[PDB]
Amino acid sequence: AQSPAGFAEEYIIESIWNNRFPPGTILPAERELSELIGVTRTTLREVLQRLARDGWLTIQHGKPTKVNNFWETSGLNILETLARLDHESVPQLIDNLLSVRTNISTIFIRTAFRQHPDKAQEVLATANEVADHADAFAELDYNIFRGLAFASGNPIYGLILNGMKGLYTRIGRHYFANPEARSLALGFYHKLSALCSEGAHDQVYETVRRYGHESGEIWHRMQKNL
């Protein structure tokens, strides 16, 4: 909410989620919607355009605006919104995002080590001198996975990490408040550097999967308390 546009956007998303405006149906006319929400038509139009780009709506000239099935039309951009809309399902959403990070990274880290080890090493070296605090590590960690994704030579993995950033770093800012989380991560970045230097193979997959499991354990034990 806050600003009129912010309030309108949140109102419409909440209305779609709670089925006031069910996915699969037509959105109410602009005049009725603006009057219902309490914003000007120009403010509403700007919000509708934003929602359309995020996949919540489909807008077409000379045609009623449709409320989409966002599970079919939205991308990673809605992760943060999903976390806000369904608090009870947040634990599972987080586990799912961490699993995606682990498994997709096995692919691009292996490729990065083979195709651009110099870039991979530069990325991993950023862990040096990192501040021993949650916010610093949350950003460092995200930057390392995103950096390795681009270091693969296939920027599409980078675009995927870009979409994951919002919720991924949010998790990180809480996860890395745990000193052990920071320690395990540093050990991981250091091991990855060694594997890259040695031109290792199977060890990369096993090392990344192991990190996902161990970091996942630390997170789960933190999550269980909340």
Q: Which of 54, 56, 174, 186 lies closest to 125 in space, CA to CA? A: 186
Segment interacting with a second copy (CB under 8 A) among 46-54, 131-139, 195-203, 215-223? 46-54
Binding residues: 95, 99-103, 209, 215
By CB under 8 A, what part of segment 127-156 binds a second copy? Answer: 150, 154-156
Segment interacting with a second copy (CB under 8 A) among 23-31, 157-165, 197-205, 214-222? 157-165
Q: Which residue is nearest to Zn ion (CB)?
A: 75
Binding residues for CoA: 95, 99-103, 209, 215
The full length of the chain comes to: 226
The minimum distance between CB 23 and a second copy, in angstroms, equals 14
Nearest-angstrom CA–CA distance, 28 and 194: 58
- Kindly tell me which of 75 and 179 has the beta carbon lying closer to Zn ion: 75
Site map (CB under 8 A) of a second copy, residues 63-102, x = contact = --------xxxxxxxxx----------------xx-xx--
Q: Which two tokens stand for residue 51?
A: 């929602």
Binding partner of residue 203 among Zn ion, a second copy, none, CB cut-off 5 to 8 Å per kind: none
Residue ranges that bind a second copy, judged by CB under 8 A: 3, 42, 45-46, 49-50, 52-55, 61, 71-79, 96-97, 99-100, 103-104, 107, 150, 154-160, 162-163
